[PDB]
Swiss-Prot record, chains A, B, C, D, E:
GO MF term set: metal ion binding; nicotinate phosphoribosyltransferase activity; nicotinate-nucleotide diphosphorylase (carboxylating) activity; nucleotide binding
Family annotation (InterPro entries): Aldolase_TIM (IPR013785), NAPRTase-like (IPR053190), NAPRTase_arc-type (IPR035809), Nic_PRibTrfase-Fam (IPR007229), Nicotinate_pribotase-like_C (IPR036068), Quinolinate_PRibosylTase_N_sf (IPR037128), Quinolinate_PRibosylTrfase_C (IPR002638), Quinolinate_PRibosylTrfase_N (IPR022412)
Lineage of producing organism: Archaea, Methanobacteriati, Thermoplasmatota, Thermoplasmata, Thermoplasmatales
Protein name (Swiss-Prot/TrEMBL): Putative nicotinate phosphoribosyltransferase
Residues bearing the modification Phosphohistidine: H182
Protein's organism: Thermoplasma acidophilum (strain ATCC 25905 / DSM 1728 / JCM 9062 / NBRC 15155 / AMRC-C165)
Role: Catalyzes the synthesis of beta-nicotinate D-ribonucleotide from nicotinate and 5-phospho-D-ribose 1-phosphate at the expense of ATP.
Any one Gene Ontology BP term: NAD biosynthetic process
């Protein structure tokens, strides 16, 4: 109940950010509430034709922390398929406790992991495409502002070297990234715009000049070469209508510059990019990418939360597998096997043993460890993305 | 800077929910700030192969209200194509003032209208498919909770008869919608679950029994017919794996019921639906629909905000059209023509005259009128969706 | 001229099962009949984008046996392409004699080999898909009863481990295969149906319980696990409408059983299967398959019979190759070369020599050997199917 | 147990032409047999994207006649969709009695109607394509001889003007159709072949000369025009390899003939034809067609027989609709509605009333009427095919 | 035998521009030459899925004129399908005489009509797309220069309002068309280039300024508007790489101009155009088009010349129709019927009678009339193209 159409932290914590059928069902259950102990697991119904970079668990802990519940989960940043080596649904988080004690949080738990995971996953695919070349999350504009930080966060953990949102950058503990906008060029003109941008380019930061405002990218690049010297990057955001063959243009610009002994000037591109276009543009000569919508508005995974056990006995609905389970992964070839919770480790054909991946983060509402900061998590993600090409 | 990875109203209002290049550019502009008066228009770069149901303007006013700026816009709920009758980009909102006074809000303005409009638009398409049959927004779970209300809001204005989010329902001033979950059936069993659900079904509300938890939809329907009498709806959420031919199953269930003199029991469906599946299921006999992801995670429109004038003179970048403009619509056949702002009305071939559609909502930061509540807006949308089949 | 619309053995033998143009042409030829000695070869016009498992020759001998004619042929069960290594049409059977003496049998000879070969061939493809897992022919129902045995026969020789037709099973000298039908479950109910089926399951035969009649496959499997112990297979015929994701369901059922220490219970599937679905279901966990229509109604090969020689001189029509020929096959890599009948063997590049494959089965109407029983033939087929993956 | 791999009428009547699970289930049921009265309906699971020309019921009566059972059915020759106006499965035959009394005939009943209906239906589609031009069934060769008559029968009832099988022709009470074969031309040569064929062309029968044996169709037609006069048809069976553009060739031949004042000679075509090719060739000038495989080997409909009632109470499996039903058809626009058996007629929006279509053919095993001969049935079919273009 | 690799008029006239097999066959025929009188017709084997605008006959007369031969033909500019109303090949030219007298010209006759007709036909399709807007042939560059005039000729007759080739323009008796090239802009710069172009724009000719050399089309258009006044057209040839959305750019430019009261300036486009792109660009605002390759390099029709009669008797090869014929066309609905040459007129169902279209142009080598100049012919074409949309 604030200014904008959002739900304050207070609200989501009180369970106001949920489907009423929950408080209504809990309520209708009444006195039986106390005698209903369950274990719910979250699995991905969503896209199964792709691996996933798990993200958003941090928020789940910030929510369940305090309730009398045990919470097991796969570490954020982990990368794996939604189905194990044998097509079994893999559980990403498991919650134990009185149904009534946390049931009203089903809506928010899913929300915290669905959208976030789609984002970090898309980022990861873009990471692979970008190679040793840097790319930054720039899409918060195409989404609601209230969540601008969780997006940059996930995008960062997914592989984005930098981020343009103030709040999000603050969240990941890095300086926001950003270059001069077309606005500056329209108000002052390229000449002044560039000059202003070069003068106000501070610290160990690389200078970048937007050149597609008034003139043709090609001649803008020549003019820039013969007018300013210390310029690290040239950025092209070229309007859809002008983008006949972006790849071709990139080569034209790079040739023009080298011919004038300015091959030292690197080329950056932005606007309407994804794994595909980023890979092709890089192969054409781009060394920096600004990725927006494709990441920030990445379709969410379809996570579902289901009671998988009642008062110690395996119980589920149609389409789900009853019983509490663990997720074993080969410390090598990264083969995964979903097994009943009474099986901790196993022998994986490839490099030794299979150890459980589903870690316990909350015991009786108490954090069982200190939660990693974004940098650490993405550091993990990057190691993990190594196994997928 | 709160508990979850979100941006408080305080934050977005201070301009903390934005790309730093803005505060950095404004700043680099310095003293010139005062002498830079501009007019920016927001147009849709996004999908042009579809009309759009504009939404999220309310939030924009809540943000710009107070700054020395004039704001013109198309009323939320309005339905039209992103390109006018002649392929000209239509401006949805226009802002006038000192660039520095509001420039840092570019990120949030877009965010407030991009995602929201995609949502209400998708809802609208589902509305057309649903016909005189009701459908409800149930997808906040598949998205981040912090925005659960703006989603239900837009989904409602787009055509959704009801909504399941507590906060969102509160926002639109309606009771949240909701039926018994599989959870209840798994914990207590159908028999008790149904009984509990029928007893706790209050007020002028229709009873609805979830029947796909344990048994086959078909026999669950027969059993229900011969065990309880006052039951308004039977809900089928049938697991993907079981959904061989949902349409066929719907007929089976309806025939089985009629044969036992219970054709009075209506059928409701939910889970993985959109315009297409909702139209086919309705034709098969469904009279109520619960729509989730397809709406709540609807891809955002790619709105772009561009300076279209500087200190009274038409000025823009490549790919945009300079000058302030008005959006005229035929009070009849609904033909639209984007024209220069010095043209208020015109003669439209079809039913009389073309009147401006772009209304002025803020004058010097002051609201020029009282803002419609959700119900009113959707009431407008529905009239407007009438013109599109 | 019997009860049903079929042709008795008496009839086909008298030449009543044929196109009249034959008896009419023979007749119109008159006295010249005696001086018309020809050699006709049967080749496949039909699908050339697939190999074929020859079948139905046995019936041809039962027909031509007794007439003054020499008959050469490729052994049933042989597997090869319709075109040799050089795209030459391969002759499967060759008949020598007075045109008038056997000409009226052209219709029945083709019929005996066209449909049968399509059947055994389809079975063979299913055999490859089934792997070391058993599958049975169950499709006679989808075809005319009068031929129910020749179908099971061919299906068996093609690779089917068992067969459900009484007559056909008798023909191949094996016990018919069969499990309890939905009918039993509908009349008595699962509980009694299963019990009855387990009690009446005799000899060294595996018990199999149909579980998709009333309840969900998943819970039917659990219930069965906790009610009966000595149950070899669980059969799922799941109705199209319920078969959302058969593969997924198979895993659900297998997991549910293993969790309850009943992974000893094997899973069998049936209904609407072919090479494709059988391969995917097996990979999902199925160890037994019941295949119907796809085999029993397999499209027939388009065999054509053509006079390839008249009174010792090479003679044919357009589209055919004149002269009597032999079909040489490499005793190794199985390369085939159609050559003129005066070439018995040759040197095949790969493993030694190429020996003739076209054997003489009838000399002056007299069988030149004892004809193999079905078991022997399929034993040959299986060796031969080994060369095709 | 006869010479060929077929099942004698004696056999199918004793129930030897069936899946053993039947006699085994009946048997296992024992004494309960007497107290098990059921009603089974046959519906089409098969292709639902096409109407069907029902055929093969005659054989079903010849089988059930004598048993204490009531049999209702839709008249052979009737043409309708497998799903009624509301997507409800339409029952083609219904059988009432003690399950044990007729259960073992499930296999043969389906077989008698599955394959036959596919055949007559395909014929019907070819009928529509052929227009006022005649076409004949010539495909028994591509199928097993034992069933050669039931094929010609169904093909005839489906719309075929004539038939080439001796037995089948006898069955429908018409003279077999037939023209001179390539064999005659290869043995004697065109010149003699034609002469022989013209001389032995008797009664009110049209002469037809096969011309694609040795020479080019074009010149064969010219030669024929200038050598013989009374020749009704010229037949072209042109070998696949020679059939570059059959339609073009047809025009060439027709032009060549007209130029030589012999446009009186009609053109007939044969070999590898179906609805499509027959329609295109007719439009090119063909006035007679010989259709084979496409009809005789037409894929069978997937009919399924299911107990729909036990001892007076509605009972079925998943995927089926319980209760006995009638099939009402509008005596006008031919709209169909499946309704519960206690509803005989109804009011159809279009031309008056909807009368039941499911007639009772057997009462206590006794025929309730005289069964139509093929000619009558096809006479009905043709009236009925009128409603489908 | 001249400088370039071409064949002088002298050469083609001596029969040096042909396949040797001709002079070699004529020669081998020897004395029989005198007694070999034939009639050859030219028909289109080529694309039959399109009508054709006949062209190049003029050249055929210039070649056969003088030989003792009669030549009948369809007038250039005539538009019709290669197959008549009944799929009969339509003869475009017919030649009568001693085979040896003109046989060596088969190669050149085809060449004169094949390529030319493809060109004029493609032009015609572009004409339809261009509407009341002018388009000019500009593609001779993409083809060999020796034929530059016959291309412009055919392109003109096909519908092109103007032509850029000097020789070709001279041939059609019109002034060549042409605008300033990028070359001028690169050497002098836009400013000077435009000025020079406006000053040297003479007579009743419209001024046109190429604007895509250095700057963005958009700003080039604004700059031009505010610097020069009397400028009829602005031409955009926009480089593939820059042509992101040509249609969008066209609107941008037109809006920019109108906003500055210069909507009087028309827009012209060129480079890589055909029916499709010309229709879409016109709908976007283009009023002038320069079409190149698509027309000048239009695939040639596959005309074939065949002896259709020898010494008065109908004679041909396989795939052709013997006898001399006339081509009748309905003076109304333009239905065409190929009929034997002894049929001059006929009754056409639609508007009266069908008159012969195949006119006699040469009698004994003597022109039977004065040949139309290009303007007249295209005047005819345009009337005729009216009947095809």
């Amino acid at each position: 109940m604030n200014v904008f159409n959002t739900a304050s932290d207070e609200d989501i914590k009180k369970g106001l950010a949920s489907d009423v059928y929950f408080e209504r069902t809990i309520s209708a259950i009444g006195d039986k509430c106390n005698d209903l102990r369950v274990a719910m697991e979250a699995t991905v119904s969503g896209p199964l034709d792709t691996w996933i970079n798990f993200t958003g668990l941090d928020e789940v802990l910030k929510l369940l922390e305090g309730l009398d519940v045990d919470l097991y989960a796969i570490p954020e940043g982990t990368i794996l398929f939604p189905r194990d080596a044998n097509g079994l649904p893999v559980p990403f988080i498991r919650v134990e406790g009185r149904y009534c004690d946390f049931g009203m949080y089903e809506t928010a738990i899913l929300g915290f992991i669905c959208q976030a995971s789609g984002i970090s996953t898309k980022a990861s695919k873009v990471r692979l495409a970008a190679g040793d070349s840097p790319f930054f999350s720039f899409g918060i504009r195409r989404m609601h502002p209230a969540i601008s930080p969780m997006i940059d966060r996930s995008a960062y953990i997914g592989g984005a070297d930098g981020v343009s949102g103030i709040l999000g950058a603050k969240l990941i503990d890095q300086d926001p990234v950003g270059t001069m906008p077309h606005a500056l060029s329209i108000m002052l003109g390229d000449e002044e715009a560039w000059k202003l941008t070069l003068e106000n380019t501070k610290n160990g930061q690389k200078s970048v000049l937007l050149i597609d405002t008034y003139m043709d990218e090609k001649f803008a690049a020549i003019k820039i070469a013969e007018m300013f010297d210390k310029v690290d990057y040239i950025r092209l955001d070229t309007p859809s209508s002008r983008r006949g063959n972006f790849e071709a243009l990139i080569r034209e610009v790079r040739w023009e510059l080298a011919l004038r002994g300015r091959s030292d000037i690197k080329i950056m591109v932005s606007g309407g990019l994804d794994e595909n276009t980023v890979k092709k543009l890089r192969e054409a000569g781009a060394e920096a990418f600004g990725v927006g919508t494709s990441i920030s508005s990445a379709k969410p995974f379809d996570f579902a939360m289901d009671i998988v056990e009642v008062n110690g006995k395996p119980e589920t609905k149609r389409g789900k597998m009853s019983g509490r389970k663990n997720v074993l992964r080969c410390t090598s070839c990264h083969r995964i096997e979903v097994v009943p919770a009474n099986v901790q480790e196993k022998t994986c054909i490839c490099g030794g043993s299979m150890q459980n991946l589903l870690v316990k983060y909350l015991s009786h509402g108490k954090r069982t460890s200190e939660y990693p900061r974004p940098k650490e998590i993405r550091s993990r993600s990057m190691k993990e993305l190594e196994y997928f090409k």
